[PDB]
């Protein structure tokens, strides 16, 4: 009795809610280039804070996805449009000795170029995956997407790379960071910590596996949704990073055509010809697969585990896809996913790989991009961190897992699992035995 109402401000109590998060860019770079300012995020471990997490449900993954789209749109906006290049192609492609690999070879056509009364013959090379065959004589070809979308050449001076990004909440909202070392994507976290901003997440763009990300604290971690076994994607996150290396040993020649926007095409190739390929530490790879199999048969009690390469679908999912700088790759990944199971740099694997220029935009089709050729020979090196698997149902008595993960949002889904955002509720009340004085 006599417990008079009292009020308290600055209260530590919060709730879940969506909000618009700040991005943050590096101090050096090539909206994004100079801003927002590079932070110095701190972090406290909180004593007894118990919070639940859900890496499938949280909103900010969608915001990452939208921001990536918007930034790509802004970067691509001032670049040239390749619409006048849509003319009929009359090409036979038998000049160089190693003809069959590319089969677009000085590939001829007409362009309007300097004077609009004039029309001039030109030619350049193309990889046949960027080409479709018209009816009648095979010499008649067309650009692949030109009957369905408008193609923009990438701005060569604005080459973009997986620059790390830190995400910062606004005032009144705090980002909760689970420090648990064996978090499965759902359930309580007893090791809650808070920060101004997230660490520097990179916008990696790849399929069937991811190339640049973080690593797990424990052993290889399995994360999947648990509403039903009939899942879309299963995320496997490596603790032991494994190196992968790739090469494009042939030397390219850049050539230019002006519309006065400078269109770039592929000139004559220099040096003897090889098919672009990759390399993998052979023992390390299927040591890691053995670890992943041992982890994976924990969930599934008493059934075999086996891998096969993906079947059907576009080139973006039938092959591992990634990019060394300003070139794009599609590596025929049959050998890597052919083990089977039941209830340290020797013997290096190599795998064949193809490259193509005209890329349907990753998140969604209907808008087309053209990457100008990169001169000379190219290699890039990365160290993978996880796999994107999907389970083939139906087959009784035998599980089967195959490389999928073509949907671009899953890459950032597998990396933003750390965090959650909460609205602060600074105002609260309580009973107490003291009242105002008149």
């Amino acid at each position, epitope marked *: 009795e006599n417990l008079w109402v009292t009020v308290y401000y600055g209260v530590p109590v919060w709730k879940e809610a969506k909000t618009t998060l700040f991005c943050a860019s590096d101090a050096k770079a090539y909206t994004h280039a100079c801003v927002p300012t590079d932070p110095n995020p701190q972090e406290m471990v909180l004593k007894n804070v118990t919070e639940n997490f859900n890496m*499938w449900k949280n909103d900010m993954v969608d915001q990452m996805h939208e921001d990536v789209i918007s930034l790509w749109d802004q970067s691509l906006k001032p670049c040239v449009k390749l619409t006048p290049l849509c003319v009929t192609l009359n090409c036979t492609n038998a000049t160089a000795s190693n003809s069959s690999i590319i089969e677009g070879m000085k590939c001829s056509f007409n362009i309007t170029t300097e004077l609009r009364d004039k029309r001039e013959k030109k030619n350049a090379l193309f990889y046949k995956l960027d080409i479709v065959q018209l009816d009648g004589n095979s010499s008649q070809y067309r650009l692949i997407n030109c009957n369905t979308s408008v193609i923009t050449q990438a701005c060569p001076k604005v080459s973009f790379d997986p620059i790390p990004i830190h995400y910062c909440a606004p005032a009144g909202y705090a980002i909760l960071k689970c420090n648990n070392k064996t978090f499965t994507g759902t359930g309580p976290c007893n090791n809650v910590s808070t920060v101004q901003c997230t660490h520097g997440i990179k916008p990696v763009v790849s399929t069937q596996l991811l190339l640049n990300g973080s690593l797990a604290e424990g052993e290889i971690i399995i994360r999947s*949704e648990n509403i039903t076994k009939n*899942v*879309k994607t299963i995320i496997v996150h490596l603790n032991e990073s494994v190196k992968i290396e790739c090469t494009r040993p042939n030397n390219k020649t850049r050539t230019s055509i002006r519309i006065g926007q400078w269109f770039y095409a592929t000139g004559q190739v220099i040096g003897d010809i090889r098919e672009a390929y990759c390399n993998i530490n052979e023992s390390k790879w299927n040591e890691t697969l053995q670890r992943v199999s041992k982890k994976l048969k924990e969930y599934f009690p008493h059934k075999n585990i086996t891998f096969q390469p*993906s079947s*059907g*679908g576009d080139l973006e999912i039938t092959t591992h896809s990634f990019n060394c700088g300003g070139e794009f790759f599609y590596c025929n990944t049959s050998s890597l996913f052919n083990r089977t199971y039941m209830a340290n740099s020797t013997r290096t694997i190599t795998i064949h790989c193809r490259i193509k220029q005209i890329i349907n935009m990753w998140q*969604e089709v209907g808008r087309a991009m053209y990457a100008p050729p990169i001169a000379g020979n190219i290699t890039c090196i990365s160290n993978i961190t996880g796999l994107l698997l999907t389970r083939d149902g139906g*087959k009784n008595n035998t599980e089967t897992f195959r490389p999928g993960g073509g949907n671009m949002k899953d890459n950032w889904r597998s990396e933003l699992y750390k965090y959650k955002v909460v609205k602060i509720e600074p105002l609260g009340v309580a009973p107490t035995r003291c009242k105002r004085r008149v």
Partner: nanobody, 113 residues
């Protein structure tokens, strides 16, 4: 509002190969998995497989993985199914059906063809 029309079918000769199709009315082509389910006469339904329209990934029932094939043409919002070497028992009715998918799971069918 959403419609899933179908074409093809009729009589098919024994041992032949046949092609169905479904035209997706405008809801959003890339957001919903599509399943191909059938019904033999005097029997309950059963599933053949599902195709993700976005990336074109198929997946089949274990008893028909040699004979089936799915693929799509995203521009036309159109789907296709190829079944090879029809046998007698495959005399049946074949349906397209939209699937309601969450961010990480597939749940059920809402609109049939």
């Amino acid at each position: 509002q959403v419609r899933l029309a179908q074409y093809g079918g009729g009589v098919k000769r024994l041992g032949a190969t046949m092609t169905l199709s479904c035209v997706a009315s405008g809801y959003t082509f890339n957001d919903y998995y599509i399943h191909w389910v059938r019904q033999a006469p005097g029997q309950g339904f059963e599933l053949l497989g599902y195709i993700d329209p976005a990336n074109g990934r198929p997946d089949y029932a274990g008893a028909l993985r040699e004979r089936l094939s799915f693929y799509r043409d995203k521009s036309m919002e159109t789907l296709y199914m190829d079944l090879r070497s029809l046998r007698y028992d495959d005399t049946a009715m074949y349906y397209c059906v939209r699937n309601v998918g969450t961010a990480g799971s597939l749940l059920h069918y809402d609109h049939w063809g």
